[PDB]
Amino acid sequence: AGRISAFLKNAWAKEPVLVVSFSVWGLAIIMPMISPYTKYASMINKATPYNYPVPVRDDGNMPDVPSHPQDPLGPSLDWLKNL
Amino acid sequence: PFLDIQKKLGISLDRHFMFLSAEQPYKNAARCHAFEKEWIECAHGIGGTRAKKECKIEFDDFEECLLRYKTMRRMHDIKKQREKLMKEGKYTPPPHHSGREEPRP
Amino acid sequence: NNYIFVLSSLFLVGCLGLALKPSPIYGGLGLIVSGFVGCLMVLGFGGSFLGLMVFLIYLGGMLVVFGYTTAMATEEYPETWGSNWLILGFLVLGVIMEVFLICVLNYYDEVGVINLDGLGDWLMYEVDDVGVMLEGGIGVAAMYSCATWMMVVAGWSLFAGIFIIIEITR
Amino acid sequence: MVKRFFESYHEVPDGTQCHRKTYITTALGGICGIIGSAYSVSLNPADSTLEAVARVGRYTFTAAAIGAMFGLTTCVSAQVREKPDDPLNYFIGGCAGGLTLGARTHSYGTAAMGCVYMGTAAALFKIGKLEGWELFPTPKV
Amino acid sequence: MMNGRPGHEPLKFLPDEARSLPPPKLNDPRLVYMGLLGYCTGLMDNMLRMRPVMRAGLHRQLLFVTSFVFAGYFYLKRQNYLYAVKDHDMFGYIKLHPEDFPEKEKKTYAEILEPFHPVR
Amino acid sequence: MNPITLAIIYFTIFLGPVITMSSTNLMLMWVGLEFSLLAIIPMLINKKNPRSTEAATKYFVTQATASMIILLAIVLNYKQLGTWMFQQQTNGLILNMTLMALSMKLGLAPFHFWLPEVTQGIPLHMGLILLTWQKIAPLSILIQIYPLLNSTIILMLAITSIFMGAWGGLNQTQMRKIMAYSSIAHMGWMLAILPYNPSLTLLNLMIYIILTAPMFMALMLNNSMTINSISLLWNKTPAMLTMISLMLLSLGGLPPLTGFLPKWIIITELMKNNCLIMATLMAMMALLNLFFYTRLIYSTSLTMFPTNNNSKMMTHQTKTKPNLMFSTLAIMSTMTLPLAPQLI
Amino acid sequence: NLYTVIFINILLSLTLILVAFWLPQMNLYSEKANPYECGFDPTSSARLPFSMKFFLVAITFLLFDLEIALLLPLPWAIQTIKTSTMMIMAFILVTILSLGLAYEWTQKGLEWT
Amino acid sequence: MPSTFFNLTMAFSLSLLGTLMFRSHLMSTLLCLEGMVLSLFIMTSVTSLNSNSMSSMPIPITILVFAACEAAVGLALLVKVSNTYGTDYVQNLNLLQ
Amino acid sequence: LRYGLLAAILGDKTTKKLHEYSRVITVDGNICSGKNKLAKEIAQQLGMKHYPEAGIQYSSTTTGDGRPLDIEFSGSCSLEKFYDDPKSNDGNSYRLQSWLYASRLLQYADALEHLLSTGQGVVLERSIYSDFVFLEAMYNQGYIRKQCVDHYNEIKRLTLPEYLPPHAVIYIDVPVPEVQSRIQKKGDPHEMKVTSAYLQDIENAYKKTFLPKMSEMCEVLVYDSWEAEDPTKVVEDIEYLKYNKGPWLKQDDWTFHYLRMLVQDKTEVLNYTTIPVYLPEITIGAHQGSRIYNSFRELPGRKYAPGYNAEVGDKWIWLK
Ligand SMILES: Nc1nc2c(ncn2[C@H]2C[C@H](O)[C@@H](COP(=O)(O)OP(=O)(O)OP(=O)(O)O)O2)c(=O)[nH]1
Numbered sequence A: 001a002g003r004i005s006a007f008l009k010n011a012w013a014k015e016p017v018l019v020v021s022f023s024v025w026g027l028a029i030i031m032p033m034i035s036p037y038t039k040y041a042s043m044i045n046k047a048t049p050y051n052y053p054v055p056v057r058d059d060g061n062m063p064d065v066p067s068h069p070q071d072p073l074g075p076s077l078d079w080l081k082n083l
Numbered sequence B: 001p002f003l004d005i006q007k008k009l010g011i012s013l014d015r016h017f018m019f020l021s022a023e024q025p026y027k028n029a030a031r032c033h034a035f036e037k038e039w040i041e042c043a044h045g046i047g048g049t050r051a052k053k054e055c056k057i058e059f060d061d062f063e064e065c066l067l068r069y070k071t072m073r074r075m076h077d078i079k080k081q082r083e084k085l086m087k088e089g090k091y092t093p094p095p096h097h098s099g100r101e102e103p104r105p
Numbered sequence C: 001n002n003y004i005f006v007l008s009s010l011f012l013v014g015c016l017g018l019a020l021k022p023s024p025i026y027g028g029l030g031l032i033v034s035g036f037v038g039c040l041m042v043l044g045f046g047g048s049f050l051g052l053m054v055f056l057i058y059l060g061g062m063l064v065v066f067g068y069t070t071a072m073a074t075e076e077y078p079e080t081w082g083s084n085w086l087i088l089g090f091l092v093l094g095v096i097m098e099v100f101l102i103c104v105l106n107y108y109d110e111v112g113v114i115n116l117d118g119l120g121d122w123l124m125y126e127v128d129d130v131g132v133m134l135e136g137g138i139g140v141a142a143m144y145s146c147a148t149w150m151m152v153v154a155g156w157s158l159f160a161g162i163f164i165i166i167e168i169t170r
Numbered sequence D: 001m002v003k004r005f006f007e008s009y010h011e012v013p014d015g016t017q018c019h020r021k022t023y024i025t026t027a028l029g030g031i032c033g034i035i036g037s038a039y040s041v042s043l044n045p046a047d048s049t050l051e052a053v054a055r056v057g058r059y060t061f062t063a064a065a066i067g068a069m070f071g072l073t074t075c076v077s078a079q080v081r082e083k084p085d086d087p088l089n090y091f092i093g094g095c096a097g098g099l100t101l102g103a104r105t106h107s108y109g110t111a112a113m114g115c116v117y118m119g120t121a122a123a124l125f126k127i128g129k130l131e132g133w134e135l136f137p138t139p140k141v
Numbered sequence E: 001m002m003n004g005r006p007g008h009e010p011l012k013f014l015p016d017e018a019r020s021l022p023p024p025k026l027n028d029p030r031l032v033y034m035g036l037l038g039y040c041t042g043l044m045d046n047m048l049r050m051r052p053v054m055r056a057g058l059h060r061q062l063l064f065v066t067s068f069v070f071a072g073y074f075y076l077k078r079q080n081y082l083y084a085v086k087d088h089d090m091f092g093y094i095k096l097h098p099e100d101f102p103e104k105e106k107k108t109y110a111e112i113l114e115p116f117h118p119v120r
Numbered sequence F: 001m002n003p004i005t006l007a008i009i010y011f012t013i014f015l016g017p018v019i020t021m022s023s024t025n026l027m028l029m030w031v032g033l034e035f036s037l038l039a040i041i042p043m044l045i046n047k048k049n050p051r052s053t054e055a056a057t058k059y060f061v062t063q064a065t066a067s068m069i070i071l072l073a074i075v076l077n078y079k080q081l082g083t084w085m086f087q088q089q090t091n092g093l094i095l096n097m098t099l100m101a102l103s104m105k106l107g108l109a110p111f112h113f114w115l116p117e118v119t120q121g122i123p124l125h126m127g128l129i130l131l132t133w134q135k136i137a138p139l140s141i142l143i144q145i146y147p148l149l150n151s152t153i154i155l156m157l158a159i160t161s162i163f164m165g166a167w168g169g170l171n172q173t174q175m176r177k178i179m180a181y182s183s184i185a186h187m188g189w190m191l192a193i194l195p196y197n198p199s200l201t202l203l204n205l206m207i208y209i210i211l212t213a214p215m216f217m218a219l220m221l222n223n224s225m226t227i228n229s230i231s232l233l234w235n236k237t238p239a240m241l242t243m244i245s246l247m248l249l250s251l252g253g254l255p256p257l258t259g260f261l262p263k264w265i266i267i268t269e270l271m272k273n274n275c276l277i278m279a280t281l282m283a284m285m286a287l288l289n290l291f292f293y294t295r296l297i298y299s300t301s302l303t304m305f306p307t308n309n310n311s312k313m314m315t316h317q318t319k320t321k322p323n324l325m326f327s328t329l330a331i332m333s334t335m336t337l338p339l340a341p342q343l344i
Numbered sequence G: 001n002l003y004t005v006i007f008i009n010i011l012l013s014l015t016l017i018l019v020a021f022w023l024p025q026m027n028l029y030s031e032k033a034n035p036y037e038c039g040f041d042p043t044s045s046a047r048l049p050f051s052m053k054f055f056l057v058a059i060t061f062l063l064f065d066l067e068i069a070l071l072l073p074l075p076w077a078i079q080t081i082k083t084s085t086m087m088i089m090a091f092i093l094v095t096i097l098s099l100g101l102a103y104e105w106t107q108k109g110l111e112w113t
Numbered sequence H: 001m002p003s004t005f006f007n008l009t010m011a012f013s014l015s016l017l018g019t020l021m022f023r024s025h026l027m028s029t030l031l032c033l034e035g036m037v038l039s040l041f042i043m044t045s046v047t048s049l050n051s052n053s054m055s056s057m058p059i060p061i062t063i064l065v066f067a068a069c070e071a072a073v074g075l076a077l078l079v080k081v082s083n084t085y086g087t088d089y090v091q092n093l094n095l096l097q
Numbered sequence I: 001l002r003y004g005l006l007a008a009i010l011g012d013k014t015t016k017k018l019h020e021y022s023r024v025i026t027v028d029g030n031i032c033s034g035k036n037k038l039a040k041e042i043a044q045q046l047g048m049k050h051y052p053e054a055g056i057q058y059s060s061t062t063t064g065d066g067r068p069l070d071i072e073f074s075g076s077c078s079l080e081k082f083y084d085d086p087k088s089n090d091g092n093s094y095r096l097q098s099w100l101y102a103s104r105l106l107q108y109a110d111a112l113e114h115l116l117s118t119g120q121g122v123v124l125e126r127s128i129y130s131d132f133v134f135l136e137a138m139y140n141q142g143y144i145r146k147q148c149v150d151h152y153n154e155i156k157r158l159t160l161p162e163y164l165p166p167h168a169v170i171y172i173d174v175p176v177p178e179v180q181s182r183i184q185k186k187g188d189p190h191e192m193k194v195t196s197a198y199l200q201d202i203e204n205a206y207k208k209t210f211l212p213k214m215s216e217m218c219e220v221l222v223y224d225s226w227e228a229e230d231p232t233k234v235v236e237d238i239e240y241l242k243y244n245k246g247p248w249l250k251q252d253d254w255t256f257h258y259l260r261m262l263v264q265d266k267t268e269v270l271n272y273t274t275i276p277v278y279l280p281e282i283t284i285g286a287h288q289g290s291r292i293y294n295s296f297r298e299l300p301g302r303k304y305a306p307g308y309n310a311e312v313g314d315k316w317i318w319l320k
């Protein structure tokens, strides 16, 4: 198991640019899989207001869709205003 | 298709930008989107030969919307009549069309 | 006010010179005059990305196309637009054919193609006034997310292009 | 207006309207000679543009000669026989056209070849227009 | 035609109605011809590869006969389904339009008058 | 040619017809046609002879300007309809642009002049992948738009391709050029049938592929370049002589072999579609395919030509260049006329 | 605005060419207008064919410029909602570009011929 | 708009006349081919801008990438032609007759 | 299995096989210049493979039965008949020379197959890069004609530059009276009958045409007869050569694999020397060729493909 380490240290001493490039490449490949903030990027891009989400009609049916904009119902943003 | 592998596997790979009335980034609708939607939903599985005599009114309205040929012809005779009436001197121009008025927002 | 028609007539003149085919060193100059004209046309139309993107990709391609003209396909006594007199007579013939075409095209059709005070008014069809995304950049940004097969096939075109060009130039 | 100008071949029968009958047959021969001379100049070029335009004039003179004398001989054969509904006037007009084509190119063997082949083709065109055959049919079945 | 027929499963080799068709037998002359084709495939391949054309390559001849009979039975089932569904679409269109495809009440030979053409 | 670029070039020439036959976006099968052009070019130049670069640049300039004409047709479809796929209510000028560009890439007779010269400068296993596999994809977009194709330009293209596939093979005595011309006559047949029944276009494409691909494998088997080089077959490999004779006369199209069946079913659907004298002219000018194939069959397997003294080592050495695919597509072509309704 | 700034830059540089040409005194002859190459007349014509030595690396400069124009919409594609397939598509095409340049680096055509 | 689109159609018909004839070089024909690349980009972007169909903005970068990649293939094809010949001209290529 | 691309990608690359003791040596001279003794000593001392001088009956003893076949099967030419009647009305000289050139083409193919298969070097006396000097000595003696020279130059232009040149070209030069003295001391009654002008013509043709053609591109070592009699100095000057200047130092492993694809099957090796050019010296007629094929297939061992002959004793013919 010393041959791979000797080749890695020899390339590190001689031409370290491809070693740094492949290490940063593998870090960029594996670091979204490690980091817990990968799932917050889709939350950011969903919870941004970007167009008008239009009001819907009601027959007294759904309780989750609010009437006042300052109601506690609906998808809140305490994970973005405080965090 | 010839090999209908997208319909076989059920996954759209080039099919979600096929016409003008496909889904758009950040929900911004194209021009003549309602005309294209009513043209496809009037040609909804009718067939090509029956649809070109059936929804010819909806295609003619959508083609008129998209290329605006009779609209530009109408504005062309309106502008030619404006040049003829300004050379005649009969048409006093309104100040709303001249632009010398306070505008509403 | 007649910006797109004046620029499109200049594009007709530049593609006419490229079509009348000089030494290709001079043809690169005429085609990049047409490229600056087309970049300014898309930037005057509302594509703030597409004209500068074709100026970047076209200046960068046409640089080494120009280098291949002045290396490989060169000639001791070349032909510009003013060198050969059949080319010069064809140039003034194409110029008088273009202005005779617009002089018969404002008169035959009786539609809104060319009018002396009614052209340029039918250029912008509809952009949303209160909307926020109307430039061309976010639609070509959507090929990463919606139209993913476009980026798959373009990356495979460039990968196969590298391998195909190594096999050609070997 | 070119196609409805060329449709004077069938709206009036042969044995009448002979001057413009010969004119539209010469115009069909001139169109075929212009495209054949353009094919011959673009395929096998001459050493000079004067020789190329002389080849163009010779080819369109040969094709205008066979078209003009084919239409004129089928018109005077309709004049002599006074029957419009036969293919034999087109047969003898095509044979006179092939004879004049072989007299232009100066070989009696291809004069006989042009006589029998364009007489067969002219009788086939007349027999198709008599029995209502379709040259370029729309797909119906 | 069959690409534009309604209810068509796209790129399906055998749909569920091909099971509702009767399947072809193994004694059928098209499969007999394809078994002869597989034996002739083995004979031609052994002749080109310079073999005894009967003695050598018996396993390759057996694979040729079996794969030819297999592909021919599956293609024969698909083509029988295609001609049966052509008959079904035609009979359905005939049942839909009797006023566009009327019954031809042919008159009898006593009633009609065929012209007599004597040769002598 | 390393195996990495060999695998990517073969996967791209597999991929281009696959995305062409799979996609319904008109620019996406333009993209597939561009993959076809791109992956064919280093295979054309990879022998590195001076004729191969000439054939490669002839192929590139013709197929690239046809790619630009069909891209004009796709962009004018975007102006006229706003969609991408060819629908029913479009102008005939754009469809004529499409048919002219696709006849340029397919090699029909007002555009055919690159195809014998392109086939002459290349080795035979590139003629295998250019003569059969390359012409699936422009034919497949032309199958996809079959109600929109205008029958006048389709039938004039068919008449000229039957006429010049008849009139290009008799003067010219090289094998790759003579089978480019016979292929030009065969796409004259499968462009004649195209707006009437595209299943018979697929049938004539499949019969022409299984009739030309083992014939190009038989040319590959001895590298038989000329008519005298295929006339040396009785001392090189005499065992293929009656099979290449049956394949030659079947590619000409005689009964009871399979090549009559495209002519028979094209005549069947053409007289169902009421086109009498023009299909008569097609089937009457089809006999010059048997003129160059009967001269070629008299060269290879009906007269034993003079051999030379150095062919006795071709009798001496063993040969492993026969493939199983040659024998199975050889007999699957040459005896399938009693299976012809299942072949429909 | 920007057209007027480009045209006043045209007018400024054209005014500088006019004051560079028309104001200085100038007599010109054939040895003065002889082209310079080290103090002698040139051996051949100066537009004689160069045999180009960076040809395959020149074509991959062109194709890499097509890749960076493919990669130019990615600062607005980072704002998209389907960020998993966006980052997978960006990962697979930068991996495609790095593997193509690694193939050219192993085949050693970066050196001239 | 129809004046601009008909003049772009005239520019394509002119560049069709340019690439459909040969004066002295294959490279000026390839410059006419790249003029067709630029004209189809300008036509596609003008069509997408006035129809406002911004979902089909993946199409003109695919036009540029595929057509300029085949243009680069033809540019190195002319490099291999001039390497195997030493000349470049259109009349040089009559050796396949 | 067989050397395909599928066998090549698993690690059958020739750069691991090739080392310093893997060279193509040709040993060259006039008639009876000690080349076979020097070739046997060179292959014995360096451990290389001694391929002998390929004659008219090389291919029959190389491929197939291994027995030398008859005078009309792998012949239609004889070296004894050429030495008896050189100006032949039957055209014996071109049939001998073209059959000998195709035989040494097969020898060069088998030597390149052996070297690129097992990595061991090979010797090749009077190779295809020096086989033109016998035809041009025949032409300068007037035994054949100008169109014969152009057809052999077309055959050599088809068959030479797809191959690789030899690494070392040993020439043993010897003067024409010593060639006549050794060809009298050998004692063959038909090879005694050759002219001295033919030997002088092949000697000065060798010294004026072949050696500037080969010394400018690959390594050529010259030696006298008394200097090349004792071979230890010859094999040490072969072993201590630098092998720098040559066309073997620019091809890669897949170029060597495509050379093995062009070399390994003989149906593309021997194809370009039987191209149809109808010169009447080498043209076998149709009845003579059909009679020689339908007597060739009735020979034992050559009726079918090898490994498939049930009349000889090739077993397992039932399932193969
Ligand atoms: N006409 C002709 N004769 C050839 C050719 N190649 C070889 N020979 C003849 C010349 C001699 O008769 C014989 C070659 O004899 P060698 O020079 O090898 O002499 P020998 O076998 O005594 O061996 P040695 O040289 O003493 O080691 O083959 C050829 O291309 N043409």
Ligand SMILES: [Mg+2]
Pocket (backbone or CB within 6 Å): I029, I030, I031, I032, I033, I034, I035, I036
């Ligand atoms: Mg010796």
